[PDB]
Every structure is written in C-alpha cells, then in structure tokens.
Design a protein around this ligand. Structure first.
Ligand code: HEM
Ligand code: HEM
Ligand code: HEM
Ligand code: HEM
Lengths: 146, 141, 146, 141
C-alpha cells in the first residue's frame, strides 16, 4: 500500500509531536488489557493480573519503548517497509513464535492511543493515513513468516 | 459475556456522549468511509462527502440504536431484534464490516471523551461493541 | 504472493482436468447456499429460495460459467494477476458495488468444490498452492477499489 | 442458531466419518499447517512433518472433541466447557485461527465423503464448525 505525498506529510507531522517512550508503554499496556490473550508472550513481565497492574508494570513500559522505537524508525522509510522490518520479521517468526495477527491488534490500539492524545488534531483524514501505515508495518513484520 | 463492571463502564462512558451521540455517529461513519473504503460499497445511493445530510441523518440513526442497546444491555437481543432482521434479510452487510464500524466508534470516543476512555473503559467498550455486532449478525444464516 | 515452480506445475495440472463450466455453476451455487447474504447481488436471477432452487437456477449456472472462465484465464498469467484483473476490479467497484470480502468467500468455496471433485488427488500440498492462487485473485480484484 | 435440519445434517455427515475421525483430524491439521503457516506459531514444540506422531495424536484429540460436540449439539457450551477454559486461559490461541482450522476440516470432509457433502450439508457443517469455534472462544475476555 502507498501513501500520497499528502498522507506522508500528515503522518510525519503528527509523529513529530509524539513521545515515543510514553506512547509505546501506553499502547502495549492497552493491548494486554483489551485483548488479554496477548499476555501469553509475557509471563516473565510479572503481575499482569489487573489493568492497574499491567499499566504500571515497569517491564511492559520498557518493552513498549522498544517496540515503538522500532516503529518510529520504520516511519523514516515508508517506501521500504519490507526491507526495514525484515530482520525483525525473521525473529518474531523463528525465535519468538508470535502469530502476526497480534501485529494488527497492536496497530489498532495505537490508532486509539493517538486519538486519545491528540483529540481534534486526529482528524478522519489523519486517521486514514495512520491506518495505512500500521497495516503496512503489520504486513512487513509478517512477510518472512514461513 | 459482559460482566457487571463492563456494564457500569459502558453505561457511564455512553452517558457522557449524551446529546452529541448524533454528532459522534456521523463522525464515526466518516472515519469508516475514509479508512476502510470497501464499506462505501454498501452506500452507493448516498453522497458520502464531508458534511453530507445523508451521513448526518444515518449517524443519528446508528447512535440512537446504540443508546437503546445501552439502556437494555441485559437483554440486547430482544431490543435490537428488528434491526437484526433488517441487516440479515434486506441490507445483508457482510459480517466482516461490523468490526470496521466498531473500531471507528472507539476512535471517535477516544478523541472526544479522553478522561473517560481509560484502559478498563476501552476494554468494556470493545466488548460491548463486539456484542452489539453479534446480535446484529445472529440471523444471517 | 508467489508460487514456487512446483506449486505452479501443481496448479496447472489439476486445472487441466477441470470442466470450467460445471465447476463454475457449482461454486457460485454453493456460495449462495452457504453464505446466503451473497444473494443480495442476484435479485434478477429468480427463485433462490432453497438449495435445490439455487443449484438448479439457469441464470446462476450461466454466471458461474462466466466468473470461472475469467479466473481460468487468470491462471495463464499468475505472474501478472493485478494487470489481468484490473478492468474487472474497476467494474466490481465502480458499477456493481461488490464488497471484496465476497471474493475471499468465493475463493474458499472453490477450494471445497475442487476437494469434492478430485478427492485424494487434492492433496495437502495441492490445496496449499490453490489457497495462494485464490488469495492472489481476490487481492487483484480488490486492488483498484477506491 | 442451528436449525433442526442442520442438526440432522451434522449428525449424519459426522456419523459417516465414524472410525476415521482420528485420521481426518490429523489430515485437517496437516492441511492447516501447509495452507496457513502462521498457525504453526502455536506448535513450536511439535515435529510438524508429514506422518508425525504428535500431529497424529493431536488430530485424534481434536476429532474426539468434535464427536462429543456432535453428540451434545443441543447443549454444546456445557459439553465443551473445559476445553474452552483451556483455550482461553492457557493456550490463548488468537480467535482468528478457529476459522482457519474450520475451513481445513470442511476440505478434508469434502475430499473423503463427497456423496454426503451436498450443498445443504456443506452449509450445515459450516454453521456447526463456526458455532464450536464460538463456544471455544467464549471465555477469552
Ligand atoms: C510494531 C509492532 C512490533 C514491533 C516494531 C516490534 C519490535 C520488537 C523489537 C524491536 C523487539 C526487540 C527484539 C530485539 O531487540 O532483538 C521485540 C521483541 C519482542 N516482541 Fe515485538 N514488535 C512488535 C509487535 C509485537 C507484538 C504485537 C507482540 C506480542 C504481543 C510482540 C512480541 C514481542 C516479544 C515477546 C518480544 C520478545 C520479548 C522479550 O524480548 O523479552 N511484538 N519486538
Ligand atoms: C454498530 C453497528 C451498526 C448499527 C448499530 C447499525 C444500525 C443501523 C440503523 C439503526 C439503521 C437504520 C435502519 C432503519 O432506518 O430502520 C441501519 C441501516 C443501515 N445500515 Fe446498519 N448498523 C450497524 C452496522 C452497519 C455496517 C457495518 C454497515 C455497512 C458497512 C451498515 C449498513 C447499513 C445500511 C446500508 C443501512 C441502510 C442505509 C440507508 O439506506 O439509509 N450497518 N443500520
Ligand atoms: C473470481 C472471482 C470473480 C471473477 C473472476 C468475476 C468475474 C466476473 C465477470 C467476468 C463478470 C462479467 C462482467 C462483464 O462481462 O462485463 C462479473 C459480473 C458480476 N460479478 Fe463478478 N467475478 C467474481 C466474483 C464475484 C463475486 C464473489 C460476486 C458477488 C457475490 C460477483 C458479483 C458479480 C455480479 C453481481 C456481476 C454482475 C452480474 C450480472 O452481470 O448480471 N462476482 N464478474
Ligand atoms: C475446532 C477447533 C478446535 C478444537 C475442537 C480443539 C480441540 C482441542 C483439544 C481437544 C485439545 C487437547 C486439549 C487437551 O488435551 O486437554 C487442544 C489442544 C490444543 N489446541 Fe485446540 N482445538 C481447536 C482449535 C485450535 C486452533 C485453531 C489452534 C491453533 C491454531 C489450537 C491449538 C491447540 C494447541 C496448541 C493445543 C495444545 C497442543 C499440545 O500441546 O498438545 N486449537 N485443542
């Protein structure tokens, strides 16, 4: 999927206002709360028993920082998302065994977290550019699954 | 199954929407048409421009349906029955699309009511909209 | 998505044994019976009230012949499915308003109809090559939806 | 809802499977692993080769579960309860995948039992497997 020059500008300017550390912690916690089966991957993280436990877990906040840092560097290469996310696709499949459906779930939680933070600035057109971007990143993470 | 706390969460988020329920339905629809353009295949007879009267009126109808689902959340099948007959026998919207309109309703509420839209509330709303979707496709086959 | 040289050979040899007329009538009738909301597109066809009505409708058998003839010519160009199905993508979107989900439903009914007809010859590997082929055709029919 | 005729259809297709139910489960699994390779992410601890003992044993367990769902088709939640707890609290298979295993079960039955697999039977089996899937994800959230 491709972005018009105008969808690209849109995306790049909102992202310039995003604290990638805090929004990554927030998106990953929401994913564990809203789709609780995603917690199967994070037995080592500790107490994930309740929404306040999950949203205040230090190890969940640190993994979100890492996941959203990688995404954030994807956004510098929207032309080449499959080469950018290729080593990571390989790891998620070969070493972590993560079903790629989880990548689409995370993508939708992140759109909700962006909405929540920017409000009126997260217009129907800016949402449409981010929906294309998160589907592209989910597709490049799944491309190299065998 | 919606838990007693889900129900309380849903009753209080939706209570804050209040008299903007019209406005929020029209906005969720517009979000759905831009983000998932295959949903426009069901509205070939509408002007789908921004500000459109048809979308404004249809967003009001969809929001008043959800308000009533919320008022009757312990008995939603009976309350949405007519609407479910309508979707299954006349409109015949493919079931895959209720997820799409469900996601754009959450985005609209995240954007308008952020103090309310905590992680526990987000989780209760996602379950509630998935469940409305289920009642509305229950008579398809 | 791409086919290995061996998946291509697989596909091409089974198809060489397919009566495209009869299998098209059969796949489209099964689609109307198994997912009855797909009948919204075919009010002109007549009595679609029951499975025997649908499976014996002359207008449904003639539309299946036409749909599966176009598919069958797709199979001569598996390298270039998006250019092959581009005019048709345009028509399904602009003039017929068919949600592209229906293309994926049809693809799965056709795999079941191929199974039913070939039996033991429709091996797990041959099924896997056809699943890739029908997803490719569904994606090329949906590519040009705006 | 499964109609009385759906139930009769399902009871008689599945009755023809009989003592091959083991064999058919193992084959449906193998079909699922080749056609949808993201499902293998749930079996990292299995040899997924053709002929594999692990897949043969697991196909038998899955088929005997369906045989029991068929024997108790007017009360499937109660009959599959333990299994649904298992999928929701331990295995935590994403719900999207029950459709995948459901499609490969239909392909296996189309391929082995063609005289039975009429359009009305195909439609009853698709509804029955969608409904087993629903009971098995009913406790996820
Ligand atoms: C945009 C989506 C994603 C990106 C960009 C991403 C990126 C990353 C990165 C960078 C790592 C670090 C691996 C390393 O540094 O070698 C990682 C590890 C991991 N990811 Fe992902 N990831 C994504 C989505 C997810 C999702 C949705 C899940 C599961 C629910 C997941 C599960 C994991 C797990 C379990 C690990 C290993 C955890 C650990 O290191 O202890 N990832 N991911
Ligand atoms: C929460 C989910 C939904 C609710 C609550 C809902 C509710 C409604 C309501 C109240 C109506 C008006 C019926 C009447 O006037 O009697 C309706 C009509 C309609 N709905 Fe749904 N709906 C939902 C999902 C969808 C989806 C996902 C689609 C398509 C993508 C859709 C397509 C339509 C169409 C095409 C009409 C007729 C429009 C017209 O001609 O005015 N609905 N729906
Ligand atoms: C492989 C999938 C498909 C192919 C290759 C295909 C191909 C065709 C072709 C060749 C036509 C003739 C149009 C013309 O000659 O100008 C057509 C018309 C049509 N198709 Fe499709 N089609 C496919 C799937 C479907 C599905 C799944 C639906 C709906 C359930 C659908 C609905 C229709 C309708 C409503 C028409 C017009 C019917 C009519 O002409 O009266 N198609 N399609
Ligand atoms: C009709 C749908 C399904 C049925 C009837 C079913 C039934 C079963 C049964 C009976 C077991 C054995 C539980 C036990 O020994 O106590 C089980 C285990 C398992 N199921 Fe499911 N299942 C279904 C769908 C799925 C799907 C779609 C997946 C993954 C894609 C899956 C993954 C597993 C796994 C990983 C185990 C544990 C395997 C092991 O370690 O032996 N199941 N299922």
């Amino acid at each position: 999927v491709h972005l018009t020059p105008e969808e690209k500008s849109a995306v790049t300017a909102l992202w310039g206002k995003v604290n990638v550390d805090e929004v990554g912690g927030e998106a990953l916690g929401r994913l564990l709360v809203v789709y609780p089966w995603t917690q199967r991957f994070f037995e080592s993280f500790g107490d994930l028993s309740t929404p306040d436990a999950v949203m205040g877990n230090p190890k969940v906040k640190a993994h979100g920082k890492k996941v959203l840092g990688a995404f954030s560097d994807g956004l510098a290469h929207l032309d080449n998302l499959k080469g950018t996310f290729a080593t990571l696709s390989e790891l998620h499949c070969d070493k972590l065994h993560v079903d790629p459906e989880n990548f689409r779930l995370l993508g939708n939680v992140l759109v909700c977290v962006l909405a929540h933070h920017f409000g009126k600035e997260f217009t129907p057109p800016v949402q449409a550019a981010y929906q294309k971007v998160v589907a592209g990143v989910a597709n490049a993470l799944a491309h190299k699954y065998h | 199954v919606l838990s007693p706390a889900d129900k309380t969460n849903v009753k209080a988020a939706w209570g804050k929407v209040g008299a903007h329920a019209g406005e929020y339905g029209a906005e969720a629809l517009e979000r759905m048409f831009l983000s998932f353009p295959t949903t426009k295949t069901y509205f070939p007879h509408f002007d789908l421009s921004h500000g459109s009267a048809q979308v404004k009126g249809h967003g009001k109808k969809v929001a008043d349906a959800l308000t009533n689902a919320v008022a009757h959340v312990d008995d939603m099948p009976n309350a949405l029955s007519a609407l479910s007959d309508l979707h299954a026998h006349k409109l015949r919207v493919d079931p895959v699309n209720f997820k799409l309109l469900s996601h754009c309703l959450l985005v609209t509420l995240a954007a308008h009511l952020p103090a309310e839209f905590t992680p526990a509330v987000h989780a209760s709303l996602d379950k509630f909209l998935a469940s409305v979707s289920t009642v509305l496709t229950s008579k398809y086959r």
